[PDB]
Amino acid sequence: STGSATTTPIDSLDDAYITPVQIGTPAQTLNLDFDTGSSDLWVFSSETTASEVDGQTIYTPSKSTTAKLLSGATWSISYGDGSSSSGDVYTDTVSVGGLTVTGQAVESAKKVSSSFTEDSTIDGLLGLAFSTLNTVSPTQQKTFFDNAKASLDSPVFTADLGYHAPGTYNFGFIDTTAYTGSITYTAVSTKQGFWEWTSTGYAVGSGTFKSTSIDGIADTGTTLLYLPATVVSAYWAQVSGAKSSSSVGGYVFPCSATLPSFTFGVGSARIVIPGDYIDFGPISTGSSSCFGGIQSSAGIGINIFGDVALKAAFVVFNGATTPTLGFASK
């Protein structure tokens, strides 16, 4: 089997991408944020505290003839930005782009933190990291990909995120028309539960490539590119007037600037992020200070190849017995 679904930016900045997901019988379609940095499929629901729902579409398990309470199971998750959610668990039929999993754990939110309530465009998350990170207790549950894997034509999914435009998540096949050149594959460590890999270096604009190992995670659920402070300083030094602002929370730059590209290495291959992908617009409405799309990871504990990086590539998440990642230009 295979599946193929379009993923759409939630706003004009590509802050996140939403993909329609069919849950239950008859189908209830929710727009979920596919997140290769976490491993829970959770949704706004008829159980979510009413004051914490503001425009999201909800899953109502009582209206699904295939929903079953997973007795005793609860979940609770905290994300890197300090947001969180928690609740109980149903199993139900879940389909993405024509690919159907029966008995998928659908984590129903009883509580969500304010950042989720305040974003009416995201109805929940669909985790695509390794199932060892799933938070369901006392019986950990598998991700949608883990459940689908054995049925797929090939045990892979691909992320093809658009710049200010829709893109595609495919399951079970590699669309050879969706990228240019060849796909370069690189080793993955699953020891922390992430799609963790080592970039071979970087370049700023037309500058020389610096060969240096940068360990980080491929994370479709993170907007920006978070890299070591040395790398980030080298990038922003090429933008006149750019500076790190403690009050704003990162590097800002004059909105009048033209940004240089940023290249990252994948083995001997190179992925080029155009400068425009690094512009996240005014820090507040009407400001002439703009927020940068490359930021320091120093306060995180891990480097994160978020959407800024991934949207410059066609990315293969190869879930074979020994997982690997593939990157191609497009």
Side-chain angles (χ1 to χ4, degrees), residues 137 195-196 220 271:
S137 178
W195 294 91
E196 186 175 359
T220 58
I271 299 294

Tab-separated table of all heavy atoms in Angstrom, residues 137 195-196 220 271:
chain	number	residue	atom	x	y	z
A	137	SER	N	0.677	5.745	28.629
A	137	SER	CA	0.958	4.938	29.795
A	137	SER	C	-0.331	4.242	30.209
A	137	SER	O	-1.403	4.846	30.133
A	137	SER	CB	1.431	5.866	30.921
A	137	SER	OG	1.682	5.151	32.110
A	195	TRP	N	14.918	11.226	14.500
A	195	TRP	CA	15.637	11.070	13.237
A	195	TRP	C	16.890	11.935	13.333
A	195	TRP	O	16.969	13.058	12.823
A	195	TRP	CB	14.753	11.463	12.064
A	195	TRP	CG	13.582	10.545	11.863
A	195	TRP	CD1	12.339	10.677	12.397
A	195	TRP	CD2	13.557	9.351	11.079
A	195	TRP	NE1	11.529	9.645	11.990
A	195	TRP	CE2	12.260	8.811	11.183
A	195	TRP	CE3	14.502	8.694	10.283
A	195	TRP	CZ2	11.883	7.648	10.510
A	195	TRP	CZ3	14.125	7.546	9.617
A	195	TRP	CH2	12.830	7.029	9.736
A	196	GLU	N	17.878	11.408	14.054
A	196	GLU	CA	19.090	12.137	14.392
A	196	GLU	C	20.205	11.741	13.439
A	196	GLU	O	20.431	10.550	13.201
A	196	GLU	CB	19.474	11.836	15.837
A	196	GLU	CG	20.634	12.656	16.335
A	196	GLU	CD	20.932	12.424	17.798
A	196	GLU	OE1	20.230	11.625	18.457
A	196	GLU	OE2	21.887	13.043	18.291
A	220	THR	N	10.098	18.045	11.316
A	220	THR	CA	9.096	18.783	10.569
A	220	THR	C	8.185	19.612	11.462
A	220	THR	O	7.513	20.519	10.961
A	220	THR	CB	8.226	17.844	9.739
A	220	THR	OG1	7.596	16.894	10.607
A	220	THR	CG2	9.019	17.105	8.674
A	271	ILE	N	22.750	20.959	0.310
A	271	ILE	CA	21.398	21.497	0.206
A	271	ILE	C	21.478	22.992	0.453
A	271	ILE	O	22.011	23.424	1.482
A	271	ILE	CB	20.447	20.843	1.222
A	271	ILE	CG1	20.341	19.325	0.996
A	271	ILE	CG2	19.085	21.528	1.166
A	271	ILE	CD1	19.678	18.918	-0.315
